[PDB]
């Protein structure tokens, strides 16, 4: 996704099983205005990953992308 235009719909579901945080490069929010907040994880090939940032375990995933 070169632009955020591709990502219009908000994730209302979770991935089958937890994704590898080590293959995650960066993260981004859906739209915010969505019924429920959600953050998409960017894999090596920019696959569509949906995880709820309100979860403590998910926050750790986002954290690894933020701090050093």
């Amino acid at each position: 996704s070169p632009y955020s235009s591709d990502t219009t719909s908000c994730c209302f579901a979770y991935i089958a099983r937890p994704l590898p945080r080590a293959h995650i490069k960066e993260y981004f929010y859906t739209s915010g205005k969505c019924s429920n907040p959600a953050v998409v994880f960017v894999t090596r090939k920019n696959r569509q990953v949906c995880a709820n940032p309100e979860k403590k375990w998910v926050r750790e995933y986002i954290n690894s992308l933020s701090m050093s």
Binding site: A13, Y14, I15, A16, R47, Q48
Partner: peptide, 27 residues
Amino acid sequence: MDYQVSSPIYDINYYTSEPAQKINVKQ
């Protein structure tokens, strides 16, 4: 033999988890 593989490439299994989610169900 029995085969149950449909080639997992994320787009399928990984991102097709929906009927297994509790969408407003009282259990």
